[PDB]
Design a binder for this molecule. Sequence first.
Ligand SMILES: OC[C@H](O)C(O)[C@@H](O)CO
Ligand SMILES: OC[C@H](O)C(O)[C@@H](O)CO
Ligand SMILES: OC[C@H](O)C(O)[C@@H](O)CO
Ligand SMILES: [Mn+2]
Ligand SMILES: [Mn+2]
Ligand SMILES: [Mn+2]
Lengths: 495, 495, 496
Amino acid sequence: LSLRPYEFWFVTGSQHLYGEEALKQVEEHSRIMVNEWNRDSVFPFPFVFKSVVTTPEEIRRVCLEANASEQCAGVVTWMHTFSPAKMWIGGLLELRKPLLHLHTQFNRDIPWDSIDMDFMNLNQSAHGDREYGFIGARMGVARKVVVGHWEDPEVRERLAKWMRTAVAFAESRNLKVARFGDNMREVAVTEGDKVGAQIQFGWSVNGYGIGDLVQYIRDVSEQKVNELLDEYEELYDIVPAGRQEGPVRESIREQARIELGLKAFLQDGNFTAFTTTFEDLHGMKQLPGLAVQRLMAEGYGFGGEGDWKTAALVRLMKVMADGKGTSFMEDYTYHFEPGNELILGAHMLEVCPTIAATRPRVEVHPLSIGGKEDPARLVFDGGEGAAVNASLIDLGHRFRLIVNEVDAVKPEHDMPKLPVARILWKPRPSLRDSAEAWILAGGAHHTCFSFAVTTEQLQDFAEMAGIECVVINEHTSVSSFKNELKWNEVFWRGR
Amino acid sequence: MLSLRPYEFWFVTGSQHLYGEEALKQVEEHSRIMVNEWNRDSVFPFPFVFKSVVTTPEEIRRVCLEANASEQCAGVVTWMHTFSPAKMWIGGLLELRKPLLHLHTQFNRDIPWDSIDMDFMNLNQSAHGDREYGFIGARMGVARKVVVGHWEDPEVRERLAKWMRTAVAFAESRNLKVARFGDNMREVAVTEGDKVGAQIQFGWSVNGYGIGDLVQYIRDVSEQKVNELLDEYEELYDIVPAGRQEGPVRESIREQARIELGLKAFLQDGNFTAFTTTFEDLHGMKQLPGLAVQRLMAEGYGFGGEGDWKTAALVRLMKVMADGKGTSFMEDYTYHFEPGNELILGAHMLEVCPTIAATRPRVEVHPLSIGGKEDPARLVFDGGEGAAVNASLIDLGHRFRLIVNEVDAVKPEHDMPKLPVARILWKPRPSLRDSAEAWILAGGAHHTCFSFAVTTEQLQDFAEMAGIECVVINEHTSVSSFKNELKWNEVFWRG
Amino acid sequence: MLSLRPYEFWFVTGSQHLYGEEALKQVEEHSRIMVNEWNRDSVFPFPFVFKSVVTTPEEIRRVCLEANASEQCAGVVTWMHTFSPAKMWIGGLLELRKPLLHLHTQFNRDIPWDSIDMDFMNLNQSAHGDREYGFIGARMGVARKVVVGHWEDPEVRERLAKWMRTAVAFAESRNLKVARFGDNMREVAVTEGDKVGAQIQFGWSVNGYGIGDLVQYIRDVSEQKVNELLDEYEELYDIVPAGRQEGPVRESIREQARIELGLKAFLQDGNFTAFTTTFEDLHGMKQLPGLAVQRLMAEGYGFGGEGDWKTAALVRLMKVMADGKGTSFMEDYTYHFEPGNELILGAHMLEVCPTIAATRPRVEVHPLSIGGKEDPARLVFDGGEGAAVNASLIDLGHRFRLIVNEVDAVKPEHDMPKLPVARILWKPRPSLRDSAEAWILAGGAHHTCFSFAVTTEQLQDFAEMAGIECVVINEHTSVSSFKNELKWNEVFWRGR
Ligand SMILES: OC[C@H](O)C(O)[C@@H](O)CO
Ligand SMILES: OC[C@H](O)C(O)[C@@H](O)CO
Ligand SMILES: OC[C@H](O)C(O)[C@@H](O)CO
Ligand SMILES: [Mn+2]
Ligand SMILES: [Mn+2]
Ligand SMILES: [Mn+2]
């Protein structure tokens, strides 16, 4: 589910005070920085050099163009010299693309024996970026700030992680969610304000009768179903009974029809996320299962039981992660063994095979929920390692993003009677404390779990979106966490 | 140095009539003893003055009114020797406009175990008297400093002595007059601000004069007094060999002395203690004021370049705090990003105060294109080393913010033969990368006041007196926590 | 004289695909006709442009992005011809930074009783289309003007036409550059303020220049062109006898002419449309600018005395709103408390704009101690009579406030033979006693922009666009109610 071309504009500020020769050297430096940066494979997207800006209208022009350019996912600004910040007011007012303020310098060291006034006039980011820093503070602008020399690999790393965040934000602002049916009845956390979320994030969330999907599934080519099956047998282990013609293989075939119909519906409307609900499956043979797991592996967002917030979150985290190690997730049951406390996570069917440590198996088991026929699904153990588990909730007047850092662990025991894929994790700082903190913050039971997305990225995304992000990790004291929820509540009110 | 009027601190002791006249006599004896002993200690830069024990609403209100009327009263230190019902203090606390310090102390250090009786319990009961007083101060939201401990404790006296300087600085701030020769450097943002608001908040009087007003004073300087001033330059500094004899270079220095004497006459006539100039308005001037300003700063005049009246007032203020020691107008010019040796070179195009010099300053003449006037004479030197603060005061539009970075000034390892300006090298805490990110996030200015003498506590206590936010970047700072505190502070300080 | 770049107004029509392509065709036809006919009605001071009917989020966002980037687009007029599901408008409304007017109209005037059917109901359904759109605007809190009624109603067209003038003033304000020769008059409070906040809020660029910069331009004025300007003074005004032939009085008038040309040269070079002076800084000048200033204002330049950049910008933008008619810098000078005939005399020490003159201006030269310079030449005249507004824009520290008093200028019944400045008399509504008290409670400045042409509706619409409070004092004003509104308003505008 690939992306349109994206690029990041590098805008360098200066002034006319020091003359045209100085301005020539500023351009020279910026053009070199961009070219060298584009040689480093750490960057997942290209920088594009933009002509040095020195006047209010040049600044405003480049910001206007950045706004209109569909490929521009972010603007990186840097003051090479002093660049009087009132000139930047008009541009900053126009800019709606994500902004990163790079506070850097062309040379690494001070040339002690040669440094003169010309050098002082030229390489003065030391103060140019501070005057620019003030107008940003003064206008209350959303920004990432990165400090360091431009060849420092740590700097390039902040830059590169940020590019994925910005590109995720670009995808978020054009994100379309299709809902097949409404929320599970009586459920609170998956409910919320779609107009509010379209205003805040850009998400478009709209509802379709399950019957619209049923028609697409009905029109699937049997030839294509059979080819998809061949692919299933190539990628996965199939339960022995499904490896021969008969009713088990047919159950699998039916998920293949569902996958192909879903995919056709979604491509037709340019949707990149979707929801289903087991309470509305008229005309469907099975709850979508294996089909959904597959579409998630292709980069589609998904939320169960009408959960559009989590479907959008899964999709944008997929973009942040470059499609790696990311899944819709739900906390299912606990292991309270002293010293070995952990969480088993799953869903009734829909867990993405990209978090699998073992080769997935296609299985068919009964599912009473929904009252439909035994669904086919992929079954596997999730892998191990550091990860995040994130929830995005609607508090009524505003949204809150909640991020728990966790450590997935390998199971020490088989779970032979368990018909769904699953993963085990130990949340930080302990199961006891993270669960209390989560509950205090009203975190959902549905989350996006990811081995790839970092907390920095989710925080930066929250900065771009203008919403609160709270983090639960190894350093969390619960009492402090309670205090921060209160202090944050007063800041984010009316904002 | 620009000497101060006599200042003094009033010691007001609270009690009540409940225990009789003999108990009140003993209270007075203790207070008189504390004042007299305190004034024998050279740690205190200003004298304490015993005030008569107060026990009634009218006595309390009277002493507060008198403190407002007294030009020499720089602050009031209040101590409850006994219970002193705080409703009696309401009237006086509403009237009082001098800075207040609540000293929570006790006459005796130790409990006389084998003789302590009800009379002693009645008399030496600060333990609750100061708490009842503590309440009324919290209840009325009064600005105050609180100091706890025995009055012969050196740590207690230290806190008191430091606060005396802060309070004197506040007294100077309330009567501060700034003269601007010319407007802000065009298009610059951080040096702009609300002079009316600043006069309301701090008392600063900031008004503008045409550069021509200064030129007329420079024209009226007597040539005899100029010659004498060159003799002092000769005595005090290393003059460039070229200027040590008659000819162009010496005439370049003689011009700064003319500027110095014209400036001094202007300022003294208007009772100004700080001033600004701008390189964009130098009509009638031969040179940008340079040496002249450097000398004036060393005498204790506040200064801000490019029309910067906030930094000018900050510099005068901090000079008072520092008793004229080790304090300068400053600006971050260029960085040294050598791993394990990151530092900042600070300077200005001419105006850096010699009170921070480690080496004997040299008088030098070099071209300065900025301003388009004749080659100006200036002092050149390396800044000294050691712990320092770098502070800027910005206007956020609806309020002011004091930002303070604790730094470590370092001795240069190499010569800078081509650098025509005085300069200083420092390592900001907790690191270059972190302090600069925090500084930019706080929107701190490029222009600061740098000081080896002023402490963070003093700046904070100043902010408390002036009713503004003060934010500190030091070795303990984490940028993510710093970021939160800005948000939470902004909600408190709003309105 | 100082002329405007071309401006136009985009007409954006909303619909949806629901009813079919033929219906969309009928929608486009209606909108093209509306634009065509509006453009054939001389009440509009600027033309409308037809924009392709928008029906999808992408079409909406595109036109809003284009409006933003178009220098000549001064405003967007939106109308929902049919239901046009408002979530589609979110992306565009977030993007749009040009002034917005929501026109709630309908193509046909009357219900066609004998033939109205479902097709018609589907097509001509602004009645609910504009309500859903109204919702999203309230929901997102956008700045907007709403106008209701049939598109051929002359009252509807009049609201539209007036708003065009306001909106064009706003575009001018957004790009306004002020030059200040010298700083504020020392110790003065109301003319002080926050230039950064003002540039953020209004867009005004405000920067300071040494008087020496102006003096240099004055010295480079061609004596030829001075003489041609002097010729033009003779043509336009009654010059005082002693200034008619060569001599000291005519030399004085000649000096103002030099100031005039240097000032204009400087201003044009930086595209400045407003400026300030200060009598406290006149080094290298022979006179305080007087006659020169009066003439620059007459050309449409904004001016504020004593460093007053807020009034200078206000003067300029109200000139634009007024199309240069009957507008001036102004200051309340002295009162006439005669019972039943209470009035205010307004003037300045020199600088009153001749466009408010009811008599032919006289060029005169009198001494002026203020500033310590040579006797300045200036235009002297009586101001006109009639309905006017007197408006002040102040800085409360944390935000700006616009204060406008509706007044009636009156003709003097007596001469003022000893009075060496131009002046005007007015009777403030609802009374001198009450208007002055309300003004003081609102902290209104002593410097104002006075105008015979600018309406209260336009100042209010400008304030809406700029996101600032506008308070009005007029014939319906009760001081006690007005006092409450200051309180309630300040709670609304705080932190906003
Ligand atoms: O551009 C102006 C100067 O050259 C310096 O950058 C410094 O003075 C900034 O205030
Ligand atoms: O004994 C009465 C005194 O006033 C004491 O200080 C105490 O009881 C006040 O609470
Ligand atoms: O567009 C849908 C319908 O036709 C109508 O507009 C109305 O029912 C909307 O509420
Ligand atoms: Mn669920
Ligand atoms: Mn500077
Ligand atoms: Mn005036």
